[PDB]
Amino acid sequence: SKYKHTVINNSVTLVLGDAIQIASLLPKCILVNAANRHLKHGGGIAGVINKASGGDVQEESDEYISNNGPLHVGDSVLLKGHGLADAILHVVGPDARNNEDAALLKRCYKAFNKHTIVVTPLISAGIFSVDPKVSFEYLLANVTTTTYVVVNNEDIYNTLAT
Ligand SMILES: NC(=O)c1ccc[n+]([C@@H]2O[C@H](COP(=O)([O-])OP(=O)(O)OC[C@H]3O[C@@H](n4cnc5c(N)ncnc54)[C@H](O)[C@@H]3O)[C@@H](O)[C@H]2O)c1
Q1: Rounded to an integer, what distance in angstroms lies between the CA atom of residue 151 and that of residue 68?
Q2: Residues in Cβ contact with 1 at an 8 Å cutoff, skipping those fewer than 6 apart
Q3: What is the distance, to the nearest Å, from the Cα of residue 58 to the centroid of all Cα atoms in its chain?
């Protein structure tokens, strides 16, 4: 403890708190960023990750994109951790505002499985406007590695913890 949490299965623990704070706690982990195709970290969790790095994350992201072009929806890229974690896995969830289908979360969450310990927000559950329950279902269905799923909204936590 130290945070409110529910163990869902052998792999997944749901945590009420801040993903950055949970990632700092763990000696070894990857932190997941809920990113857009251009890795422009203007807001949401992406914004808070970038600011916690003092803009180091945006700097790196720009270099990656500048040289490699935009990601596809459902793609991910493992980049440096900038002291927040061992590395940051930037994952591009579907944006329901752009009629992108929630089923692309399968690709997002499968990318977790090659990592030993993952700390993640619910992908697409913010401004990308996927039902948190739907995002969580896709996570449980596809994630097979040790994962701390961190939500900062107690009402969302209660819904998913039932
Ligand atoms: N031009 C641009 O900058 C541009 C354009 C289009 C889209 N977008 C991006 O789309 C992104 C992704 O949307 P999304 O829904 O996948 O992301 P998200 O940040 O919006 O939401 C993910 C979930 O995690 C929660 N959360 C937020 N901060 C948290 C924290 N500290 N710890 C744990 N949980 C936290 C949110 O409340 C939400 O439930 C935006 O953050 C933004 O970067 C940006």
Answers
A1: 31
A2: none
A3: 16
CA of 41 from ligand 1 middle (Å) equals 9
Only one residue has tokens 């790196």, namely: 60
State which ligand 1 atom lies nearest to the alpha carbon of 22.
32
**Number of CB atoms found within 10 A of residue 7's CB:** 10
Q: Give me the resolution in angstroms, 1 decimal.
A: 1.8
Q: Which residue from 31, 38, 45, 159 has its CB within 8 A of the most atoms of ligand 1, so it is best to mutate?
A: 45
3-state secondary structure of 135: helix
Establish whether residue 42 lines the binding site of ligand 1, counting it when its CB lies within 6 angstroms of any ligand atom. yes
- How close is the Cα of 144 to the center of ligand 1, in Å? 23
Task: Provide the 3-class DSSP secondary structure of residue 120.
Answer: strand
Domains of the chain by range and CATH? Answer: 1-162 (3.40.220.10)
End-to-end C-alpha distance for the chain, whole angstroms: 18
Amino acid present at 10: N
How were these coordinates obtained? X-ray
- Which residue has the CA at smallest separation from atom 24 of ligand 1? 121
Which residues lie across from 14 on neighbouring strands?
6, 149
Give start and end residues of each alpha helix (H) in 3-121: 19-25, 44-52, 56-68, 105-110
